[PDB]
Symmetry: C5
Amino acid sequence: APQTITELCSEYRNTQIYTINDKILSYTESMAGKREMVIITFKSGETFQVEVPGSQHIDSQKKAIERMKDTLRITYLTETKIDKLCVWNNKTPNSIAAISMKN
Amino acid sequence: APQTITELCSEYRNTQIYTINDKILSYTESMAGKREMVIITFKSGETFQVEIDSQKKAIERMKDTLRITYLTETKIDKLCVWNNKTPNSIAAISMKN
Amino acid sequence: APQTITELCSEYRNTQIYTINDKILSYTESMAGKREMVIITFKSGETFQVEVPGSQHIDSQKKAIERMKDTLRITYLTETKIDKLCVWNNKTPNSIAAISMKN
Amino acid sequence: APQTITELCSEYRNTQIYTINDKILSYTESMAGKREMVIITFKSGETFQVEVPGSQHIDSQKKAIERMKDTLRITYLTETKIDKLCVWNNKTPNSIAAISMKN
Amino acid sequence: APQTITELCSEYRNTQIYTINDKILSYTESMAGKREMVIITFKSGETFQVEVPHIDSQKKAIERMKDTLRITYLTETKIDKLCVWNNKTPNSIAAISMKN
Ligand SMILES: CC(=O)N[C@H]1[C@H](OC[C@H]2O[C@@H](O[C@H]3[C@H](O)[C@@H](O)[C@H](O)O[C@@H]3CO)[C@H](O)[C@@H](O[C@@H]3O[C@H](CO)[C@@H](O[C@@H]4O[C@H](CO)[C@H](O)[C@H](O)[C@H]4O)[C@H](O)[C@H]3NC(C)=O)[C@H]2O)O[C@H](CO)[C@@H](O[C@@H]2O[C@H](CO)[C@H](O)[C@H](O)[C@H]2O)[C@@H]1O
Ligand code: NA
Ligand code: NA
Ligand code: NA
Ligand code: NA
Ligand code: NA
Ligand code: NA
Ligand code: NA
Ligand code: NA
Ligand code: NA
Ligand code: NA
Ligand code: NA
Ligand code: NA
Ligand code: NA
Ligand code: NA
C-alpha cells in the first residue's frame, strides 16, 4: 500500500495534491435533499467538498465518506492544522479523497 | 455543487438565511414524542429545531453537529432554515470565527 | 412545536421538570442484563436513569435512547451544566425524557 | 431499579466491585485474530478487559459492548478518574460489566 | 486471555512489537476507492497503516482502530507500543497500547 498521501494520490487519474498548511476557516454542513454534503474553506482562498454519496462510490467508500465528514467537523472545531489534501480535481468544488494533518 | 451556504439555500423553496454570528445559548434534546427533537436558542431570542437512508444519516449528523457546537461554545455564522415549520427547521449550518 | 423544555414536558403524562442548574457529579454505565442502564447523580442527591425499556423494539426509539446516553457521557466529561431534566416520574430512579443545557 | 453501581453489582452472583479512585494507567486495543479486545490497567496492578464473548450474538448486547469500549477510550484520553468497576469474575482478566466515574 | 500487548502480539505469525513512546506527528485518512486506509507517522520516521477492510466483527474492529488513532492524534496522546503485521507495506497495526 502507499506510505504517504502524495504516493496514494499518484495512484488515481483525476487527483491532485494541495499543500494547505492551515486550519479550516469555515465549515458548512447541509442535510437538504440531494445536497447532503460538507464544504470547507481556508483563509488562503481554497474551497473543498465531501461529495453527496452516489454511483461514483463503491460500498467500502460509504462508511469512509461518513468518516471523512466526522474528521472535517472535529478538525474544524479543534483548529487542527491540515498539511495536505488529495482531491478529485474534476469536481466543483474539488472533492476530498484524502486528508493529512500535521503541526 | 454550491460553494457557500447562501448559494445552497437559494436552490430550495421555503428556505431563508438567518445571520447569527453567535454561539448557541441553549441546547434541548427530547425523546418524549414520536420523533426525537433537538431545539437550539440564541441570546437574540431566535429558536430553531432539527427535522431515504441518506436523509436519515444527514439528520443524525446535524443533531450531532449542534450538540458539539453547543458544548465547544463555537460561533455559528449562518443558518439556512425551512420557514414553513415552527420553530424553523435547520437545512444547513455554517461556522466561522 | 414546543420552544422550551418546560413547554415540551407539559405535553406528556407522568412527566415532571427537575431544575438542576449543575454539572453531573457521577456517571455510571452498565451492560449487566438487558436494561443497559446509564445512571447520573448530582451533588443535590438526585439520581436519574436512561434505560432501554423491555417493551421498546422500534428502531428510531432505540437510536434516540443511544443519542441520549451519548449526550449524558459527553456532558459529564466536559463538566457541562444541566439546566433542566424532563423525567418520567413512575420509574425509580426517574427516567430522562428530555434534557436542556444553558450557561 | 438500582440507584448505584454497588446496588446494581449486588444483583449478580458472578460480579464483584473493585473500588479504583484513579485514572486509567494504560489502554490497550487489539484486533489481532478473531475477537477485538480492550484491556485497561491501573497503577495498583489491577487489569480488566472488554470483549464480545464468542457465544454472544444479540445486537442490543453488541451495541452495549461497543459503547463500553468507547467509554474506556475517552475516559483514558481525558485522564478521567474511575470511582468503581463492577466486573465478571468468571474469567481473567476480569470483564467489565459496569463503570462509575466521579471526581 | 492475554493481559499485555506483548502477550497478544506473540499469538500470531508475522507480528512484531514496535516501542514508540511518542505522540503521532501526522494522521492521514483516505476515502479513495480500494484505499480506504489510515496512515500515521512519527517524527522518529516510522510510518504505519490501518489496512483496507474479513468477517463483520473484523470490519468493526478496523473502524474502531481508525477512530482511536484520530482521537489519539488530536489529543497529542503518547503511544507506548504498536503490535504490527510486519509482512505488509507499510507495517499494518494489529494492536496499540498507550501509557504516560
Ligand atoms: C474513458 C477512458 O479513457 N477509460 C479507460 C479506462 O480508464 C479507467 C476507468 O475504467 C473504467 O472501466 C472501463 C473498463 O476498463 C472498460 O473495459 C470498459 O469497456 O469501459 C469501462 C468504462 O470506462 C472504470 O469504470 C473506471 O472507474 C471509475 O473511475 C472514475 C474515475 O474516472 C471514478 O470516479 C471518481 O469517483 C470519485 C469518488 O469515488 C470522485 O467522485 C471523482 O470525482 C470521480 O471521477 C469511479 O469511482 C470509478 N468507478 C469504479 C466502479 O471503480 C476507471 O477505472 O482504462 C481502460 C484500461 O486502461 C481503458 O481501456 C483501454 O482503452 C483503449 C482505448 O482508449 C484501448 O481500447 C485499450 O485496448 C483498452 O484497455 C479505458 O479506455
Ligand atoms: Na474559494
Ligand atoms: Na483559537
Ligand atoms: Na475556536
Ligand atoms: Na462551556
Ligand atoms: Na466559556
Ligand atoms: Na447487556
Ligand atoms: Na476541570
Ligand atoms: Na455481585
Ligand atoms: Na497527563
Ligand atoms: Na474533569
Ligand atoms: Na521513539
Ligand atoms: Na494540538
Ligand atoms: Na502541540
Ligand atoms: Na493528556
